[PDB]
Amino acid sequence: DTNIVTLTRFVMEQGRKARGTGEMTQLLNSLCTAVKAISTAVRKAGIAKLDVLSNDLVINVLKSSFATCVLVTEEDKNAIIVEPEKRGKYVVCFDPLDGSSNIDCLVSIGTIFGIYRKNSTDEPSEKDALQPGRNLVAAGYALYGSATMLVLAMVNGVNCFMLDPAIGEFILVDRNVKIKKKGSIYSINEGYAKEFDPAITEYIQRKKFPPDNSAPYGARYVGSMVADVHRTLVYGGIFMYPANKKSPKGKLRLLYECNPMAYVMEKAGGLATTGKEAVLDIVPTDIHQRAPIILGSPEDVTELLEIYQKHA
Amino acid sequence: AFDTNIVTLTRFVMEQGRKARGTGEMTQLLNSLCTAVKAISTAVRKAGIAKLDVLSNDLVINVLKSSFATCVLVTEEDKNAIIVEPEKRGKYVVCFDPLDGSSNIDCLVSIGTIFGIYRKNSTDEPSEKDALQPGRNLVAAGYALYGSATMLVLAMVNGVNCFMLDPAIGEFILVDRNVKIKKKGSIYSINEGYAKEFDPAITEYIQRKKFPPDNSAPYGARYVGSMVADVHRTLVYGGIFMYPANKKSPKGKLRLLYECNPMAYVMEKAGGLATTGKEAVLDIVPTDIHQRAPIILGSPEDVTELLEIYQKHA
Amino acid sequence: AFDTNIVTLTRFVMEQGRKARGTGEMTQLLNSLCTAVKAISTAVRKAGIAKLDVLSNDLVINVLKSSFATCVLVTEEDKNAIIVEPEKRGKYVVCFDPLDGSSNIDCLVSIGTIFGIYRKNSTDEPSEKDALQPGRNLVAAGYALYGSATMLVLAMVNGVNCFMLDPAIGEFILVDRNVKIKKKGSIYSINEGYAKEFDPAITEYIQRKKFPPDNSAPYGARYVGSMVADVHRTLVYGGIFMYPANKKSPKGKLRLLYECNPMAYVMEKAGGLATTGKEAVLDIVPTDIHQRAPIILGSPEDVTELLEIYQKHA
Amino acid sequence: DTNIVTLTRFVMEQGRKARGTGEMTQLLNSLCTAVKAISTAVRKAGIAKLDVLSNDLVINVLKSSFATCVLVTEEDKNAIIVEPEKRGKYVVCFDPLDGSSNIDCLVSIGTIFGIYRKNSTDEPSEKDALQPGRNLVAAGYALYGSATMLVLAMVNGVNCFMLDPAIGEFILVDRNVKIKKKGSIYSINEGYAKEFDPAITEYIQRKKFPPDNSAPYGARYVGSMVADVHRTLVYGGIFMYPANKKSPKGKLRLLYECNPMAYVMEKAGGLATTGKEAVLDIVPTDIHQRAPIILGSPEDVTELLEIYQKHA
């Protein structure tokens, strides 16, 4: 239509309110170019490694935005420090293409990103990225499924923008997403049943065989964190990838999968914990350290936390 | 860049339907189905920026009528079968579900169009009786998945072939020829929310997947909740998919003519099994166009691990 | 939004080729030509970000061969006619120019694919002799224009129909049915750079357009320099298009089999005339597949204003 | 590819060099959203006035850019003054869809734009737009033909960007376009032959019947100024819409068709005159006043100017 709220018309007009420099806008704007390009690549990732194109694409658009100074990728052993000539105030942690093995099976996959602000006065460095997820200034993910959706949580809310392929623009579709208090779906890889700790195994049981003789919870697990979390967000429910004996630390990385999603959830009123501490309050020591994550509708994550410390 | 020898689905069915002195009518049918599949893929892709299942249903009916290749059409969204008018008739019976899982759009989980094609084997007037053939009698069956990519999988007598929509030229382009599922897999797909109603065969099977007796690694679980998504993942990576019988859905949930049989035929033409637990899904004589049936499809060796167990509980 | 009753070119030729108990082979031919036209439209649209005429030529030959509807193919880019192998043969002769004006891409002026389809009228082995029919014997002819939109115009026995490529679903969608050119127009299209070599008939005609004797307003001039662009503008707005004979190109520039005759047939099936200045272009017996011929096409009344003048100078 | 120079990566990096505020970038960025949307509309302007959508679209994206303050359209009787809350330093004169009657005949058409800077301290007003075309700070056009091309002339050169429909991004394809000195094509509506003034009619003659007994000039006239000027630019030649007795003032409007094109030509080394004065040096009195325009390769426009004053 004639006055279409693009993601840029939206981020630019909220940046004005902070009496800013334009860097958040430039950043998100260049990110989007990566997102549309990775989407087009996946919509034909059969007519003819994608990890790599994707990574180099995102590092590139972000360097050229004159808004970053440290960039942490799933794919890179050490953090990337941006050249002085192109530096800016933001720190971005991102996984450029999450759940990549799933592309053969046409499983929705996505790019996950969390942005921090470098606060110190010394040279850009890894330590600027070792902040609590609580201090993110913006986070979100783009989901490459039947449609390409970019969900963006900033200080003012969680918003959903959809890619309109006809004009190559992200259009604002859902404003100020709030999650449901309690929902009916539980999401978890039950093929690890024997590895699970006692609090999970009891919670699973009470959902399947509800003690109140009410409706059992439906199970859903796409196997791709973005598909599952986007689901937990728009429909409500609980998603869980907890520690187990094959992974006492959890599987999902703290800086670029758990803290962004957790920031998005808590901004929409959900909770996200490791079943012991809030995810967002964990203070990272390694830019690639893993975390247990349990996130979703509040009443359900809460029910799980009572089972956790009722077992103490 | 830009290839001169594009194998489109239309070209490919013609290098099958022609050597057989065949119809080439089939081709017109399928070419029409591709128009409906493309238009649904676009609507889904801008769904949140623009009911959809109904509109899909009307599209698939109009394109099918105008192929001059159908006489009877059964739909999930329609009671009695649609008997195509004589002017436009041709010999096939198409059974279809235009947008399985249409509830799931709001959460952007992949959904899809499933179809089974029968040939009318009679001298008579078309009537919905023409649709009630057992699955073994299918001439061609497959599905269209609307996901990160739009994939058309079409199984016909010789084998299963996958096609991907090249969004630029608007054509399904061949990407996997003569597909064959793994013999055994490492995944099982079932909604364990219904764990309470499950019949004993399944419960022992699932526990044997999770807690392996012969000390293997436990099978992973995966369950998208869209039939097409879980069937396609099972076809390419392998594994076992189960929507068995439980009490709340006592003869299964999935409809026989357009969901279970098309999948069962794609799956069996790719070397996998599809059973209800007692009999093969492709041998049930259909009685209501909307009759239901339980289905277990997947890698030969895992389906059979479940049949040994079914037999042990009768 | 999203229409359920899309009239695609494939549906439309089937509601022509079917009532006539026809081929439906024609349909397969045309469906293949649409695949080539779409792939060329995309390549042009990213041309400056990615020879093209050669690659177009190979595409059109492969898609045409695989329609199982051709036996002889003549091209601007090929010497002797391509005789399709027996395995793939069918009854038509397609004469085509895969990318007229391909020089003009660099300046982003619209260019296009022109085609004429003949039916082989003999019991013999295909040979390029099968291509040398006069234009009156064309079964179907039209063009694809790559411009601000991609338009396919297809003229067949009954009339001319325009189709526009819906870029989202990748399908030519009908947008003008049974087209008819204006009787008289207000535009003349000719390259007056060649004003020195022009034969006297034309020179008096042009001066009568610019400096009207019967005190009308002078005709406007328009000359894109791409045959398809100027023919299409003449078909929809009217007017007269002239690439007559001059000395530097003494029998005209435009080739008869695939440029002049397809246009002349579209134009005459839309109620306009196409002559060389002495005879109608649709009656010349072709002798070389690359034979040339002058053409004047356009609104009946203006072509005739020029023929009165041609006759007055013989 | 992975490091694709978008129009934004280009304008942003040249704006940095001026130690600017970001407004040129914001402006061109929002303009582009109009351009891609008008392109998509014309690529299906048959499967189902366009002037109007187009106009409302461009006024809208430009207001929301926080970079304009006066906007002059072909389509609007009076100038548009932007609301204070959304004002910025630039003045834009644009014709949103030039040659619109031509869409039925699938004639390439385009959006023409010229940007000035408001220099005075008083309230935004028409007079800020009444500047010489010599003072444009940026100008160009987007052409909606077989491809959508945006040609952009700024202080540093003329550059050509092409719309990649797959990613909805303008990619930089031709850097620092220079025109040919002399070319072989002349472009003009010869259906006005009797209305032409003597200098034109003689020039026409010497091209057709070259006095030097050399190659005659080829004639080309699409009837759509952008198609013809883009042609004159990339291939060289001369384009002419001079005064005649039906139009002693010319036809093409000074502020939004003649001055932008003339700015683009002179930046690529061509010339543009009314056959009496330079186009760019004309000082506008009415925001909609017309101008004779003759533009192209230098030697050819020059040849015409000698014929003009040889006739004095």
Ligand SMILES: O=P(O)(O)OC[C@H]1O[C@H](COP(=O)(O)O)[C@@H](O)[C@@H]1O
């Ligand atoms: O492993 P990645 O390719 O980095 O992607 C992350 C994915 O890794 C997990 C897979 O674990 P599992 O198969 O045990 O469920 C998913 O939950 C999640 O989407």
Ligand SMILES: O=P(O)(O)OC[C@H]1O[C@H](COP(=O)(O)O)[C@@H](O)[C@@H]1O
């Ligand atoms: O067409 P639907 O109404 O969605 O019904 C079938 C759907 O329901 C099946 C399982 O759903 P659930 O586990 O919620 O019963 C899926 O395989 C499929 O998408």
Ligand SMILES: O=P(O)(O)OC[C@H]1O[C@H](COP(=O)(O)O)[C@@H](O)[C@@H]1O
């Ligand atoms: O296929 P082409 O090499 O371009 O030859 C034919 C072209 O040449 C004709 C006129 O060109 P010119 O006036 O330059 O001779 C056009 O109608 C057409 O595009």
Ligand SMILES: O=P(O)(O)OC[C@H]1O[C@H](COP(=O)(O)O)[C@@H](O)[C@@H]1O
């Ligand atoms: O008249 P517009 O729709 O504003 O478009 C401008 C067009 O107006 C002129 C038409 O004039 P003519 O037909 O006399 O050549 C073209 O040169 C030019 O492209």
Ligand SMILES: [Mg+2]
């Ligand atoms: Mg990851």
Ligand SMILES: [Mg+2]
């Ligand atoms: Mg269904």
Ligand SMILES: [Mg+2]
């Ligand atoms: Mg040609």
Ligand SMILES: [Mg+2]
């Ligand atoms: Mg104009």
